[PDB]
Design an enzyme around this catalytic site. Structure first.
Site, PDB file in Angstrom:
ATOM      1  N   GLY A  38      51.085  36.320  50.607  1.00 37.51           N
ATOM      2  CA  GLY A  38      51.174  37.707  50.150  1.00 37.51           C
ATOM      3  C   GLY A  38      50.485  38.630  51.124  1.00 37.51           C
ATOM      4  O   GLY A  38      50.090  38.204  52.214  1.00 37.51           O
ATOM      5  N   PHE A  88      44.114  43.875  55.197  1.00 28.18           N
ATOM      6  CA  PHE A  88      44.412  44.115  56.619  1.00 28.18           C
ATOM      7  C   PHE A  88      45.756  43.530  57.099  1.00 28.18           C
ATOM      8  O   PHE A  88      46.074  43.617  58.284  1.00 28.18           O
ATOM      9  CB  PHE A  88      43.253  43.582  57.482  1.00 28.18           C
ATOM     10  CG  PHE A  88      41.903  44.174  57.131  1.00 28.18           C
ATOM     11  CD1 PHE A  88      41.148  43.657  56.075  1.00 28.18           C
ATOM     12  CD2 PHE A  88      41.382  45.241  57.850  1.00 28.18           C
ATOM     13  CE1 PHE A  88      39.907  44.194  55.745  1.00 28.18           C
ATOM     14  CE2 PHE A  88      40.143  45.781  57.524  1.00 28.18           C
ATOM     15  CZ  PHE A  88      39.405  45.257  56.471  1.00 28.18           C
ATOM     16  N   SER A 137      49.170  40.397  56.247  1.00 31.58           N
ATOM     17  CA  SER A 137      49.701  39.243  55.517  1.00 31.58           C
ATOM     18  C   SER A 137      48.677  38.111  55.376  1.00 31.58           C
ATOM     19  O   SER A 137      47.823  37.917  56.244  1.00 31.58           O
ATOM     20  CB  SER A 137      50.965  38.712  56.206  1.00 31.58           C
ATOM     21  OG  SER A 137      51.975  39.701  56.224  1.00 31.58           O
ATOM     22  N   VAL A 138      48.770  37.382  54.269  1.00 29.45           N
ATOM     23  CA  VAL A 138      47.962  36.190  54.062  1.00 29.45           C
ATOM     24  C   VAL A 138      48.922  35.014  54.116  1.00 29.45           C
ATOM     25  O   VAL A 138      49.840  34.944  53.306  1.00 29.45           O
ATOM     26  CB  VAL A 138      47.184  36.233  52.718  1.00 29.45           C
ATOM     27  CG1 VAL A 138      46.433  34.925  52.478  1.00 29.45           C
ATOM     28  CG2 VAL A 138      46.227  37.421  52.715  1.00 29.45           C
ATOM     29  N   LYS A 173      44.511  22.006  53.717  1.00 25.81           N
ATOM     30  CA  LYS A 173      45.388  23.132  53.387  1.00 25.81           C
ATOM     31  C   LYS A 173      44.529  24.385  53.202  1.00 25.81           C
ATOM     32  O   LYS A 173      43.544  24.344  52.463  1.00 25.81           O
ATOM     33  CB  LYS A 173      46.162  22.857  52.108  1.00 25.81           C
ATOM     34  CG  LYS A 173      47.308  23.824  51.870  1.00 25.81           C
ATOM     35  CD  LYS A 173      48.124  23.396  50.664  1.00 25.81           C
ATOM     36  CE  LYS A 173      49.370  24.248  50.526  1.00 25.81           C
ATOM     37  NZ  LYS A 173      50.067  24.016  49.235  1.00 25.81           N
ATOM     38  N   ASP A 227      33.837  44.816  42.208  1.00 24.28           N
ATOM     39  CA  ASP A 227      35.195  44.730  41.646  1.00 24.28           C
ATOM     40  C   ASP A 227      35.442  43.411  40.898  1.00 24.28           C
ATOM     41  O   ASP A 227      36.507  42.825  41.017  1.00 24.28           O
ATOM     42  CB  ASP A 227      36.190  44.927  42.793  1.00 24.28           C
ATOM     43  CG  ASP A 227      37.627  45.216  42.319  1.00 24.28           C
ATOM     44  OD1 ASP A 227      37.876  45.497  41.117  1.00 24.28           O
ATOM     45  OD2 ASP A 227      38.525  45.104  43.178  1.00 24.28           O
ATOM     46  N   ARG A 267      41.690  39.278  38.049  1.00 21.71           N
ATOM     47  CA  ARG A 267      42.543  39.352  39.229  1.00 21.71           C
ATOM     48  C   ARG A 267      41.856  38.953  40.535  1.00 21.71           C
ATOM     49  O   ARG A 267      42.542  38.639  41.497  1.00 21.71           O
ATOM     50  CB  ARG A 267      43.150  40.769  39.371  1.00 21.71           C
ATOM     51  CG  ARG A 267      42.129  41.861  39.714  1.00 21.71           C
ATOM     52  CD  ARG A 267      42.725  43.257  39.887  1.00 21.71           C
ATOM     53  NE  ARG A 267      41.613  44.208  39.959  1.00 21.71           N
ATOM     54  CZ  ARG A 267      41.070  44.853  38.925  1.00 21.71           C
ATOM     55  NH1 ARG A 267      41.565  44.759  37.703  1.00 21.71           N
ATOM     56  NH2 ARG A 267      40.033  45.638  39.127  1.00 21.71           N
ATOM     57  N   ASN A 268      40.526  39.002  40.577  1.00 17.89           N
ATOM     58  CA  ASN A 268      39.752  38.633  41.758  1.00 17.89           C
ATOM     59  C   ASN A 268      39.146  37.242  41.680  1.00 17.89           C
ATOM     60  O   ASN A 268      38.483  36.784  42.613  1.00 17.89           O
ATOM     61  CB  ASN A 268      38.674  39.697  42.027  1.00 17.89           C
ATOM     62  CG  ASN A 268      39.241  40.945  42.694  1.00 17.89           C
ATOM     63  OD1 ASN A 268      40.154  40.867  43.521  1.00 17.89           O
ATOM     64  ND2 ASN A 268      38.692  42.100  42.346  1.00 17.89           N
ATOM     65  N   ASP A 272      37.140  38.372  46.214  1.00 18.28           N
ATOM     66  CA  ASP A 272      37.635  39.740  46.205  1.00 18.28           C
ATOM     67  C   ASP A 272      38.851  39.858  47.114  1.00 18.28           C
ATOM     68  O   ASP A 272      38.754  39.584  48.309  1.00 18.28           O
ATOM     69  CB  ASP A 272      36.537  40.698  46.664  1.00 18.28           C
ATOM     70  CG  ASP A 272      36.826  42.134  46.291  1.00 18.28           C
ATOM     71  OD1 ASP A 272      38.002  42.472  46.038  1.00 18.28           O
ATOM     72  OD2 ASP A 272      35.872  42.931  46.250  1.00 18.28           O
TER      73      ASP A 272
HETATM   74  C1  LIG Z   1      32.368  39.164  50.547  1.00 16.08           C
HETATM   75  C2  LIG Z   1      33.803  38.815  50.745  1.00 16.08           C
HETATM   76  C3  LIG Z   1      34.457  39.040  51.917  1.00 16.08           C
HETATM   77  C4  LIG Z   1      35.806  38.695  52.057  1.00 16.08           C
HETATM   78  C5  LIG Z   1      36.521  38.120  51.027  1.00 16.08           C
HETATM   79  C6  LIG Z   1      37.950  37.797  51.294  1.00 16.08           C
HETATM   80  O1  LIG Z   1      38.439  38.013  52.406  1.00 16.08           O
HETATM   81  N1  LIG Z   1      38.636  37.259  50.228  1.00 16.08           N
HETATM   82  C7  LIG Z   1      40.020  36.997  50.104  1.00 16.08           C
HETATM   83  C8  LIG Z   1      40.504  36.594  48.865  1.00 16.08           C
HETATM   84  C9  LIG Z   1      41.853  36.325  48.692  1.00 16.08           C
HETATM   85  C10 LIG Z   1      42.725  36.459  49.763  1.00 16.08           C
HETATM   86  O2  LIG Z   1      44.078  36.209  49.664  1.00 16.08           O
HETATM   87  C11 LIG Z   1      44.530  34.981  49.214  1.00 16.08           C
HETATM   88  C12 LIG Z   1      43.747  33.846  49.352  1.00 16.08           C
HETATM   89  C13 LIG Z   1      44.242  32.628  48.884  1.00 16.08           C
HETATM   90  C14 LIG Z   1      43.781  31.284  48.833  1.00 16.08           C
HETATM   91  N2  LIG Z   1      44.670  30.493  48.267  1.00 16.08           N
HETATM   92  N3  LIG Z   1      45.729  31.288  47.935  1.00 16.08           N
HETATM   93  C15 LIG Z   1      46.899  30.717  47.283  1.00 16.08           C
HETATM   94  C16 LIG Z   1      45.513  32.583  48.289  1.00 16.08           C
HETATM   95  C17 LIG Z   1      46.300  33.722  48.150  1.00 16.08           C
HETATM   96  C18 LIG Z   1      45.802  34.947  48.622  1.00 16.08           C
HETATM   97  C19 LIG Z   1      46.627  36.173  48.481  1.00 16.08           C
HETATM   98  C20 LIG Z   1      46.513  37.390  49.176  1.00 16.08           C
HETATM   99  N4  LIG Z   1      47.435  38.253  48.773  1.00 16.08           N
HETATM  100  N5  LIG Z   1      48.144  37.604  47.827  1.00 16.08           N
HETATM  101  C21 LIG Z   1      47.692  36.364  47.625  1.00 16.08           C
HETATM  102  C22 LIG Z   1      42.222  36.858  50.977  1.00 16.08           C
HETATM  103  F1  LIG Z   1      43.079  36.986  52.011  1.00 16.08           F
HETATM  104  C23 LIG Z   1      40.897  37.131  51.179  1.00 16.08           C
HETATM  105  C24 LIG Z   1      35.873  37.855  49.748  1.00 16.08           C
HETATM  106  O3  LIG Z   1      36.424  37.350  48.777  1.00 16.08           O
HETATM  107  N6  LIG Z   1      34.505  38.231  49.679  1.00 16.08           N
HETATM  108  C25 LIG Z   1      33.870  37.967  48.414  1.00 16.08           C
HETATM  109  C26 LIG Z   1      33.699  38.991  47.488  1.00 16.08           C
HETATM  110  C27 LIG Z   1      33.085  38.729  46.273  1.00 16.08           C
HETATM  111  C28 LIG Z   1      32.661  37.447  46.021  1.00 16.08           C
HETATM  112  F2  LIG Z   1      32.063  37.181  44.840  1.00 16.08           F
HETATM  113  C29 LIG Z   1      32.816  36.423  46.911  1.00 16.08           C
HETATM  114  C30 LIG Z   1      33.428  36.690  48.121  1.00 16.08           C
END
Ligand SMILES: Cc1ccc(C(=O)Nc2ccc(Oc3cc4cnn(C)c4cc3-c3cn[nH]c3)c(F)c2)c(=O)n1-c1ccc(F)cc1
Ligand SMILES: [Cl-]
Ligand SMILES: [Cl-]
Ligand SMILES: [Cl-]
Length: 273
Positions: free
Chosen positions: A27, A31, A33-34, A48, A152, A156-157, A170
């Site tokens: 998704g 910044f 695509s993931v 993975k 946040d 959802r997070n 997040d």
């Molecule tokens: C402090 C900090 C910094 C940075 C992050 C961060 O970069 N998180 C982050 C999260 C999700 C992301 O996306 C996915 C990841 C996965 C993994 N598996 N699957 C299936 C996924 C699908 C998606 C997806 C994206 N779009 N649609 C689906 C993603 F890319 C980056 C973060 O979480 N924290 C933080 C904030 C507060 C806390 F308590 C702890 C850490």
């Protein structure tokens, strides 16, 4: 401009780009695509992963530095209910990337909703719902102990692993998760996360209802200033409701800590046969 500081901060979690093989799009994120991916590890195994990338456009030196700050912010989080940084790829490519663990069942909010449909997960039992709340409280206990503020926190997070463990994260409406003192002033503390945690518990107990049905976003501040709070879900134990209700006490100083919430939630869960 802290690009030199950031590169030194992230040195020991840099990964060789060619260890990583990218796959399909999961998704869009803050910044870009993931992607899903596979990462060959130091001991020789495979993993993975999810790979956070930056858009192909010339995203500024500020966007790049903001991207890497987030990774540096995560870097030392080591807890089973908190998302972990697997590493970063910088120096081989024009936009850097952040490697994270794959979360098989995605975000908890969508999962709760799918559980009410025949094709996805089945009906989630009460004990599993409570265990999700416990996991989140465990993660938040760890973070608030480190003086990290989420800001946040919401279903959802939160992300679900293959074994159904919840990880706090997040991804990068929301008025409805914000503590009263944080709506009223710019003030955020760990007690503001407690409030958002209570709302997340209510999301979980309702199996994914939007908070405050029949109250619109622009009405929320007034509604909370008049002392009104989320109502008890129809199938919700009174004790569980008392716990979520304590998260929304008007004075932050009267809300419980994450340690207390977690103890109370474990006790309730263990009280069930
Ligand atoms: C402090 C900090 C910094 C940075 C992050 C961060 O970069 N998180 C982050 C999260 C999700 C992301 O996306 C996915 C990841 C996965 C993994 N598996 N699957 C299936 C996924 C699908 C998606 C997806 C994206 N779009 N649609 C689906 C993603 F890319 C980056 C973060 O979480 N924290 C933080 C904030 C507060 C806390 F308590 C702890 C850490
Ligand atoms: Cl993780
Ligand atoms: Cl709904
Ligand atoms: Cl309500």
């Amino acid at each position: 401009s802290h690009m030199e500081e950031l590169q030194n901060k992230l040195e020991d979690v840099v990964i060789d780009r060619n260890l990583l093989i990218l796959g399909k799009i999961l998704g869009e994120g803050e910044f870009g695509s993931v992607m899903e991916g596979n990462l060959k590890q130091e001991d020789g195994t495979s993993l993975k992963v999810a790979v956070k990338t930056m858009k192909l456009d010339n995203s500024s030196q500020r966007e790049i530095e903001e991207f890497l700050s987030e990774a540096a912010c995560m870097k030392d989080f080591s807890h089973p209910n908190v998302i972990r940084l697997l590493g970063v790829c910088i120096e081989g490519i024009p936009k850097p990337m952040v490697i994270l663990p794959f979360m098989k069942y995605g975000d908890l909010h969508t999962y709760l909703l799918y559980s009410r449909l025949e094709t996805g997960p089945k009906h989630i039992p009460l004990q599993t719902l409570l265990k999700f709340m416990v996991d989140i409280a465990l993660g938040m206990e760890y973070l608030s102990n480190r003086n990290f503020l989420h800001r946040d926190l919401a279903a959802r997070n939160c992300m679900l692993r293959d074994d159904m463990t919840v990880c706090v994260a997040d991804f990068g409406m929301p008025v409805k998760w914000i503590a009263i003192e944080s709506l009223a002033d710019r003030v955020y503390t760990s007690k503001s996360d407690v409030w958002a945690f209570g709302v997340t518990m209510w999301e979980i107990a309702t199996r994914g209802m939007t908070p405050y049905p029949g109250v619109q976003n622009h009405e929320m501040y007034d509604y909370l200033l008049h002392g009104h709070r989320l109502k008890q879900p129809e199938d919700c134990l009174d004790e569980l409701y008392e716990i979520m209700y304590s998260c929304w006490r008007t004075d932050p100083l009267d809300r419980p800590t994450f340690s207390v919430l977690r103890l109370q939630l474990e006790k309730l869960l263990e009280s069930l046969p």
